[PDB]
């Protein structure tokens, strides 16, 4: 059968944490990095570490074009540890209201990156571990981990062309 949703949940933690680290580094000559970002669940050369890295690279030009608008919108929302679960949940639910596709799955990683970075840079709170759980649990509970598993896991995102 397919890999389990539990396996995809583990893989998602690895993809997200790698993604966050490599995304911050590619944006650093444009925000302090949360020191927790250098702690990964596994070595970064693992398969899921490579997937996270490649997804960060693929999105670079897209994410740069939307930075100013997202920065303004998050400054207005003022996410903190006290409201981040509510805002993450509502935004993620709306992102997936029409169904699942790989762009939305990868965009959820990007939103998690921006949310964690804002809470740290502006809220002075390290919240990366918590946002990691928000992302993993959201995917588990809204059938996304299952959808991923049934397509062969996260490596599928890099193999659609």
């Amino acid at each position: 059968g397919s890999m389990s949703e539990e396996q995809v949940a583990q893989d998602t933690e690895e993809v997200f944490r790698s993604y966050v680290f490599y995304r911050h580094q590619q944006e650093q000559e444009a925000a302090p990095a949360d020191p927790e970002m250098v702690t990964l669940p596994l070595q970064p050369s693992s398969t899921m570490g490579q997937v996270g890295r490649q997804l960060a690279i693929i999105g670079d030009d897209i994410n740069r074009r939307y930075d100013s608008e997202f920065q303004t919108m998050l400054q207005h929302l003022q996410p903190t540890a006290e409201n981040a679960y509510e805002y993450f949940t509502k935004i993620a639910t709306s992102l997936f209201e029409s169904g699942i596709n790989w762009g939305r799955v990868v965009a959820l990683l990007g939103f998690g990156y921006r949310l964690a970075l804002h809470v740290y840079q502006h809220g002075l709170t390290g919240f990366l571990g918590q946002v990691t759980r928000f992302v993993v649990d959201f995917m588990l509970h809204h059938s996304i981990a299952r959808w991923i598993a049934q397509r062969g896991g996260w490596v599928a995102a890099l193999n659609l062309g």
């Binding site: 693929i58 939305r104 659609l160």
Partner: peptide
């Protein structure tokens, strides 16, 4: 309402990512 505006922007980014991945 403002949540919806942010989600709308993420949905736009997602379609750009999807196109690039495909």
């Amino acid at each position: 309402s403002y949540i919806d505006k942010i989600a709308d922007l993420i949905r736009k980014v997602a379609e750009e990512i999807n196109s690039k991945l495909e």
